């Protein structure tokens, strides 16, 4: 085992200390070479699209009920920014040289990136969920732009506090984890329990709550487009707003459903990458571990994890 102590210990594979190898960690070398182009070629362009939104935002009576979109854009802007470490340095310190080599829990060479990626990833989801609640108010309630803004400190409290505590709960006795050569410090890439408990579950609960209240908002407006006929001109004028919510919600809920699918795939897969490592390790290399999903699944994993923030552009471009 290329580790013997945290030079917890550093114990990953059912042991006092060990660490899975950095090259050919899971997959074939070839696909890493084109991920080296592709992860950036999608992430930096997604970041370029997302930064324009914040640029326009920094410049229609009030923005109180559309406010969470700004912080959504900021959050996934940062997510894309620190995925841009995919080929930014053209060095891979986060897989430290032979030094906590694979990835160092409780050492600087990894922690400086997980605490931002996980934090902003959770923050963006909470921003979308409370954007759903923001639209829930002033759709079925009788609440105004100023009245909803009066809860803004509670909204910021929840939105920046849930990610804060979910990070606070990942010190020595908890799980800060590594990355592939195409990756940056993040939790759960090698440990299934970290994924199952403190990644997959929050995303699922957020998406569920959003669907709940998003539908109980859109079809709560449904009772108004018809069933009060005196000012027709808004029909197919307020339609632009409803259809914009719908398009935004599709373009958001697609990637999260897909990534939850990918994590459910890994929660039923990684159990066999190991049970056969007893038969691919003890040398260099159920009957096979991975297949064509060697890219076509873990590639759309990162693709959807980055294009969660794309709804911002088709939201802002429909209001000009």
């Amino acid at each position, epitope marked *: 085992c290329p580790r013997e102590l945290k030079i917890l210990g550093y114990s990953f594979l059912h042991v006092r200390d060990c660490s899975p190898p950095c090259p050919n960690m899971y997959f074939r070398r070839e696909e890493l070479s084109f991920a080296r182009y592709f992860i950036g070629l999608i992430s930096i362009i997604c970041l370029s699209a997302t930064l324009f939104t914040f640029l326009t935002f920094l410049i*229609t*009576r*009030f923005r*109180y*009920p*559309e406010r969470p979109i700004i912080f959504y854009a900021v959050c996934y802007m940062m997510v894309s920014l620190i995925f841009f470490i995919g080929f930014l340095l053209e060095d891979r310190v986060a897989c430290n040289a032979s030094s906590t080599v694979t990835q160092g829990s409780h050492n600087k060479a990894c922690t400086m990136l997980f605490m931002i990626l996980y934090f902003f990833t959770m923050a963006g989801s909470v921003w979308w969920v409370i954007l759903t609640i923001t639209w829930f108010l*002033a759709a079925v309630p*009788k*609440w*105004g*732009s*100023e*009245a909803i803004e009066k809860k803004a400190l509670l909204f910021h409290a929840s939105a920046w506090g849930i990610p804060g505590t979910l990070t606070i709960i990942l010190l020595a006795m908890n799980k800060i984890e590594g990355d592939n050569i195409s990756g940056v410090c993040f939790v759960g890439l090698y440990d299934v329990d970290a994924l199952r408990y403190f990644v997959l579950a929050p995303l699922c609960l957020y998406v569920v709550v959003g669907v709940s209240l998003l539908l109980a908002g859109i079809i709560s407006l449904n009772r*108004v487009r018809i069933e*009060i006929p*005196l000012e027709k001109e*808004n029909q197919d*004028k*307020l339609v632009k*707003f409803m259809i914009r919510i719908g398009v935004f919600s599709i373009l958001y809920l697609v990637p999260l459903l897909v990534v939850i699918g990918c994590y459910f795939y890994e929660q039923a897969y990684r159990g066999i990458w190991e049970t056969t490592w007893i038969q691919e390790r003890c040398r260099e290399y159920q009957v096979t571990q991975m297949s064509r999903p060697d890219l076509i699944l873990f590639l759309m994993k990162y693709l959807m994890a980055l294009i969660v923030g794309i709804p911002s552009v088709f939201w802002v471009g429909s209001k000009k």
Partner: nanobody
Amino acid sequence: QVQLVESGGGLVSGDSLRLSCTASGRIFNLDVMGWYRQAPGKRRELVADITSGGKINYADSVKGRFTISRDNTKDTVYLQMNSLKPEDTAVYYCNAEVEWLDMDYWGKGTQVTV
């Protein structure tokens, strides 16, 4: 809804003058609701906006002369035009808005003369 509170202006106020507007056909929370003029001229200009209890905003050439208020259980915006001189001659329009949906409500039927 507006009511015509008119006589001819004062017929050249006497001691004061007020307008009222009131909305009973509503769905969403009227955020900003106020008044607009027209000379009769090529434009319809702003007078005074209220934003549900705050941010009263008078006209950039007329500020510091009028007053505006609002009730909330009854969606009534008021405008008292004290120290009135003729160039206030205009057919006035009460206005209301909901922001996020971008729906604008206009009333009809009020005129002041001198």
